Ligand binder design. Structure first.
Ligand code: XAN
Ligand code: XAN
Ligand code: ZN
Ligand code: ZN
Lengths: 451, 451
């Protein structure tokens, strides 16, 4: 417990304050107190003194120095879309696309998690594992089950991860064994919001209203949830425009609306704090509504490729001023790692570019931005998360490119044969790094994970 | 050294004898003697006796049992295309596409490896690292340097990996600091072939004639190499139809030919043992020539995506009877892992499918096939490699899905909540496995790697 203890981290700090830039600050001291960054001084020669200089009420005994060659601090990753409840099925989907995959794998496993023993095991695994890949903040879709969603929020609080925890709402078009009625779906959402806000009462743990997607939610349910969302100022997360059959289904189910996006817009679910997952097949008009309502987009490339859903036009969305983050979308996406997700966003943008132009391509720096600040923007937490800056939360991971077992190698003579830049080193971690390189993770200035 | 020692491996054996099938043999004994599989008996109750039954000249003392829950044997991966010399640059390529990437990164690093100290370090790293990812057989492009190519072949022999080692030939369109003249390029190829065949004299180490690609090789050089290849019955490897600017360049450079493929065909380099890397933008006519000449194709998805080269139409090539393997294509591809390569081949086939049909999609089983047998077919070694079958080489890796640090998790209750098949377990390793799950590697019935 670091609360009340003035921390100063010294070393190399890497982050992405603006899309496309990679800020590398060597020999830098970052002061952290009660989870908040108090100063960032480049070329610190005296980290303790940097603290004493910052606050004269401090003495050397009040300061804890943390000493970071091959190693840097990077912001915690933000996973804007993760069905923790589906984790048992990562890698398991065969040749299926979305709607068959829902029927065959997802409703079965989500229902199975009504058993608290299974859920508790799954939740502990996924929180620990995403932490070990550097994910400090995650928006979790759970299941329709109230009790298990509360437990997920409890264990999130316990383990120190920053989360939004959603009870999934489904009152239409689900199997009888895995469906709610409208009143239950709404009221259990009210309860879960209350329990998280008033009982869990933890700044790291937030509720999020989770209409599964338009085919699963009646007009009445969506309007009720929308009123809850407006009155209680709650985040929202749902899927949008992922798969063409899904899109056709939505059109068939809501012919009074202009588009899938218009369904959510008309029944009140598009807000500054709505996280829209996938958003592949959007029309220009749909993207314009999303912009006007200031919703954020969770880009889930692994899922989109594995389910043959399509290619998210990330550049096209960014070019319109829509904020974009990354989501693992477990389990449609097999990986718990936003780093892995980032690498695939990089690849997906190039499949697009092969037919569009180079413009569609995302750089390493941009994907890392999406993996951190982008997600914070989507969650509307970018004033407090995503970069090493004064006032922001110390959500951070230590990256050691020479941690044991690392696939990120560098030869001494790279650091007149060609030499690596600092940017190159970051790119080697981006492409070949994994959890083994994330050796420590901090959330809110607390260490929550140690390799 | 296991030579002269009758080995029997007992456990679960997974392999892909035919495209699309995943053969899982539990409680199976595989007898291995002097690198060759002698029997495969499903439901072995007595592995020692299975050996005594196989060969009455044996006694219990002559038999060494190797005992494999979460673990199976899988064939060693085949990397049909790897520029070991470019390894220092994995992850390093920025926004570049092929021709800029050659100029900016590849010729510089390849030239740098004329320094034997650097090369020795690189070769030891890459052989050890590809072994640790389960790559038992690899076709290596080195550099134009004779001495370093010999060393690569020496260290390959020393470390136990099965390799084809190519001295790169370039006598045109290269920078003055990294080019050969025609006579040197040919004669150093003759020498390297001789040195490998007659001095290294190791069944695991083979030469391979390596014209870099058509723009780098004069008509005279190609014809000389073609005659060498015919007279000495040597493998060939080159790049084909990777990047549209490259393709235009070839057309401009060889306007007397009908196509890029026709350049290699006319000057004699298309043979049953020619490994053609990439082969993205082939016309129907080009693919037909490749079929008629019985060349194999190295599919290098990571490179193809990272350099925005395009999407290899793997299904379309397979549908024509052309054999396809996987290649990492270090360093245009950042990964040394054919497993990683396989996962990306899986993804690339789905980007294709999004616009073609489901037909273009590769299953998990098919990618694993490409990763093993496919590569063996491309190298024309599939009678002796790629599967656990009698007469074939014991090129094999032990996969432990619960090795330390594994990202392949399974809950006990997955092995009435939904249960995993054996195929599902393999798919979880396919999508979330990495080198940490490859705990032992055997080449030619010798253990060459231990985690
Ligand atoms: O990627 C997704 N995962 C899901 O569980 C889901 N449900 C509806 N739509 C969905 N998309
Ligand atoms: O993927 C590739 N890597 C290379 O070094 C190369 N050279 C020519 N063409 C090439 N393609
Ligand atoms: Zn989802
Ligand atoms: Zn290559």
């Amino acid at each position: 417990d670091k609360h009340g203890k003035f921390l100063v981290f010294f070393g190399t700090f890497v982050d992405t304050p603006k899309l496309g830039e990679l800020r590398i600050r060597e020999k830098t001291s970052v002061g952290v107190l009660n989870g908040i960054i108090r100063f960032v001084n480049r070329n610190s020669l005296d980290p303790v003194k940097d603290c004493l200089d910052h606050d004269s009420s401090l003495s050397p005994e009040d300061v804890t120095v943390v000493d970071i060659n091959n190693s840097f601090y990077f912001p915690g990753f933000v996973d804007t879309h993760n069905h923790v409840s589906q984790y048992p099925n990562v890698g398991v989907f065969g040749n299926s696309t979305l709607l068959d995959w829902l029927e065959k794998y997802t409703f079965p496993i989500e229902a199975a998690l009504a058993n608290e023993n299974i859920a508790r095991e799954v939740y502990n695994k996924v929180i620990s594992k995403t932490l070990s890949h550097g994910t400090t903040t995650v928006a979790y879709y759970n299941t329709i089950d109230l009790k298990s969603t509360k437990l997920l929020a409890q264990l999130s609080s316990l383990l120190g991860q920053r989360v939004l925890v959603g009870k999934v709402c489904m009152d239409t078009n689900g199997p009888e064994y895995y469906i709610e009625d409208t009143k239950t779906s709404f009221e259990s959402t009210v309860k879960v919001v209350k329990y998280i806000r008033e009982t869990i009462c933890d700044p790291l743990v937030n509720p999020i209203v989770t209409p599964r997607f338009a085919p699963s939610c009646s007009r009445e349910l969506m309007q009720q949830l929308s009123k809850l969302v407006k009155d209680e100022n709650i985040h929202v997360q749902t899927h949008l425009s992922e798969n063409k059959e899904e899109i056709q289904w939505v059109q068939d189910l809501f012919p009074e609306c202009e588009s899938y996006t218009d369904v959510y817009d008309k029944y009140g679910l598009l807000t500054e704090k709505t996280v829209l997952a996938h958003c592949i097949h959007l029309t220009d008009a749909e993207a314009r509504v999303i912009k006007q309502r200031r919703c954020g987009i969770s880009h889930c490339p692994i899922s989109n490729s594995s389910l043959t859903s399509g290619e998210c036009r990330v550049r096209w969305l960014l070019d319109q001023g829509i904020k974009v983050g990354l989501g693992t979308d477990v389990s449609a996406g097999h990986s718990c790692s936003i780093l892995t997700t980032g690498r695939q966003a990089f690849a997906v943008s190039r499949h697009l570019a092969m037919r569009e132009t180079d413009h569609a391509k995302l750089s390493v720096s941009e994907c890392l931005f999406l993996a951190t600040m982008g997600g914070a923007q989507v969650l509307r937490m970018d004033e407090t998360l995503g970069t090493f800056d004064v006032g922001k939360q110390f959500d951070a991971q230590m990256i050691d490119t020479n941690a044991p077992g690392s696939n990120v190698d560098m030869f001494h003579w790279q650091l007149n044969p060609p030499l690596l830049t600092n940017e190159d080193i970051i790119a080697k971690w981006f492409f070949n790094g994994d959890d083994r390189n994330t050796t420590k993770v901090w959330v809110a200035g607390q260490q929550v994970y140690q390799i």
